[PDB]
Design an enzyme around this catalytic site. Structure first.
Site, PDB file in Angstrom:
ATOM      1  N   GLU A   1       0.814  -1.204   0.000  1.00  0.00           N
ATOM      2  CA  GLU A   1       0.000   0.000   0.000  1.00  0.00           C
ATOM      3  C   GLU A   1       0.862   1.275   0.000  1.00  0.00           C
ATOM      4  OE1 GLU A   1      -3.038   0.421  -0.734  1.00  0.00           O
ATOM      5  OE2 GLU A   1      -3.927  -1.556  -0.396  1.00  0.00           O
TER       6      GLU A   1
ATOM      7  N   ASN B   1      -7.466   9.105  -6.040  1.00  0.00           N
ATOM      8  CA  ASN B   1      -8.282   8.121  -6.775  1.00  0.00           C
ATOM      9  C   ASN B   1      -9.031   8.837  -7.884  1.00  0.00           C
ATOM     10  OD1 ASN B   1      -9.129   7.117  -3.491  1.00  0.00           O
ATOM     11  ND2 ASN B   1      -7.623   6.108  -4.718  1.00  0.00           N
TER      12      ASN B   1
ATOM     13  N   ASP C   1     -12.143   8.927  -8.592  1.00  0.00           N
ATOM     14  CA  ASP C   1     -13.385   9.591  -8.162  1.00  0.00           C
ATOM     15  C   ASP C   1     -13.186  10.917  -7.371  1.00  0.00           C
ATOM     16  OD1 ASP C   1     -12.585   8.737  -5.674  1.00  0.00           O
ATOM     17  OD2 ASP C   1     -14.376   7.531  -5.263  1.00  0.00           O
TER      18      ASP C   1
ATOM     19  N   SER D   1     -11.573  11.105  -4.341  1.00  0.00           N
ATOM     20  CA  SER D   1     -11.177  10.788  -2.977  1.00  0.00           C
ATOM     21  C   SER D   1      -9.660  10.582  -3.006  1.00  0.00           C
ATOM     22  CB  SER D   1     -11.891   9.524  -2.505  1.00  0.00           C
ATOM     23  OG  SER D   1     -11.447   8.396  -3.231  1.00  0.00           O
TER      24      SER D   1
ATOM     25  N   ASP E   1      -6.296   8.375  -0.845  1.00  0.00           N
ATOM     26  CA  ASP E   1      -5.907   7.352   0.115  1.00  0.00           C
ATOM     27  C   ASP E   1      -4.728   7.917   0.928  1.00  0.00           C
ATOM     28  OD1 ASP E   1      -7.771   5.561  -0.965  1.00  0.00           O
ATOM     29  OD2 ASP E   1      -6.238   4.461  -2.100  1.00  0.00           O
TER      30      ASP E   1
ATOM     31  N   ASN F   1      -9.071   5.461   2.649  1.00  0.00           N
ATOM     32  CA  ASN F   1      -9.780   6.313   1.725  1.00  0.00           C
ATOM     33  C   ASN F   1     -10.722   7.341   2.369  1.00  0.00           C
ATOM     34  OD1 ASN F   1     -11.803   6.859  -0.567  1.00  0.00           O
ATOM     35  ND2 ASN F   1     -10.398   5.571  -1.643  1.00  0.00           N
TER      36      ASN F   1
ATOM     37  N   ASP G   1     -15.761  -4.466   8.380  1.00  0.00           N
ATOM     38  CA  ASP G   1     -16.832  -4.332   7.399  1.00  0.00           C
ATOM     39  C   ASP G   1     -16.956  -5.692   6.671  1.00  0.00           C
ATOM     40  OD1 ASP G   1     -18.843  -3.124   5.898  1.00  0.00           O
ATOM     41  OD2 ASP G   1     -17.557  -1.550   5.072  1.00  0.00           O
TER      42      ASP G   1
HETATM   43 TB   LIG Z   1     -19.742  -1.027   4.419  1.00  0.00          TB
END
Ligand SMILES: [Tb+3]
Ligand SMILES: [Cl-]
Length: 129
Positions: free
Chosen positions: A35, A46, A48, A50, A52, A59, A101
């Site tokens: 990473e 990124n 879009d 956003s 990192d 993010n 998540d």
């Molecule tokens: Tb989620």
């Protein structure tokens, strides 16, 4: 801060990442390597809009506030800049919420494509842990 491999493993372990949500320490060290190359100041934009941030490239679309990701969330209730500190506490606590998540460590693209299914224990071999 650019951590050394064993140095990062020891900090991650101290902060309770080792075996967190069932992922051994080597998984986390391997993810941090691919990473950010163990660099806490790493940032990557990124497509879009956003960004990192940090050792685990967390993010701004969902997890931290950077003030320039319109309509995003801040689920770790932290400024994204907290994720660039020499102290990995903020990044560790936020990573614990991410891996909790539904998709576990698959949330980290470099983990899924470069660590998953490999001999991840090699990332902590030789360390005094
Ligand atoms: Tb989620
Ligand atoms: Cl391991």
């Amino acid at each position: 801060k650019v951590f050394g491999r064993c140095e990062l493993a020891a900090a991650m372990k101290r902060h309770g990442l080792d075996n967190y949500r069932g992922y051994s320490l080597g998984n986390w060290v391997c993810a941090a390597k691919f990473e950010s190359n163990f660099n806490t100041q790493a940032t990557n934009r990124n497509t879009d809009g956003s960004t990192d941030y940090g050792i685990l490239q967390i993010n701004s679309r969902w997890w931290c506030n950077d003030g320039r990701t319109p309509g995003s969330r801040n689920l770790c209730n932290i400024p994204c800049s907290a994720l660039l500190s020499s102290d990995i506490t903020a990044s560790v606590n936020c990573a614990k919420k991410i891996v909790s998540d539904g998709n576990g460590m698959n949330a980290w693209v470099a983990w899924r494509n470069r660590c998953k299914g490999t001999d991840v224990q090699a990332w902590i071999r030789g360390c005094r842990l």
